[PDB]
Each structure stands twice: as structure tokens, then as C-alpha cells.
């Protein structure tokens, strides 16, 4: 429900919310503290899973 445009920073549990709000498996983003870019995804267990830089 906030995008830039294709073509700010949070924290894993906010990148999930989006991740859903949008319906995708997986979100690319940046890292609150880090300021890396990390990727949230849901897994297939269920469980959701998370990557850094």
C-alpha cells in the first residue's frame, strides 16, 4: 500500500507485512540498522525466511 515507482528503510517483520499486503513470495529491501538490502520470502513449510545484502 506504498511504493516508489519501477523502473525508506525497515525491518524484517515490516518487509513481511508489504511482502503480503502486495501478495508477492518475496520483498527486496533495506535494512533499518544495517542499510543493507535484504529479501524476506515465505518458505514452503510455512515458516518465512530472510537474506542479507
Given at each position: 500500500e506504498?511504493?516508489?515507482?519501477?523502473?525508506?528503510p525497515?525491518?524484517?517483520?515490516?518487509?513481511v507485512?508489504?511482502?503480503?499486503?502486495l501478495?508477492?513470495?518475496?520483498?527486496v529491501?533495506?535494512?533499518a540498522?544495517?542499510?543493507g538490502?535484504?529479501?524476506?520470502?515465505?518458505?514452503?513449510?510455512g515458516?518465512?525466511?530472510?537474506?542479507?545484502?
Amino acid at each position: 500500500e506504498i511504493v516508489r515507482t519501477k523502473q525508506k528503510p525497515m525491518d524484517s517483520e515490516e518487509a513481511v507485512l508489504q511482502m503480503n499486503l502486495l501478495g508477492h513470495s518475496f520483498y527486496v529491501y533495506t535494512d533499518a540498522e544495517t542499510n543493507g538490502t535484504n529479501i524476506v520470502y515465505s518458505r514452503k513449510d510455512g515458516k518465512y525466511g530472510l537474506i542479507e545484502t
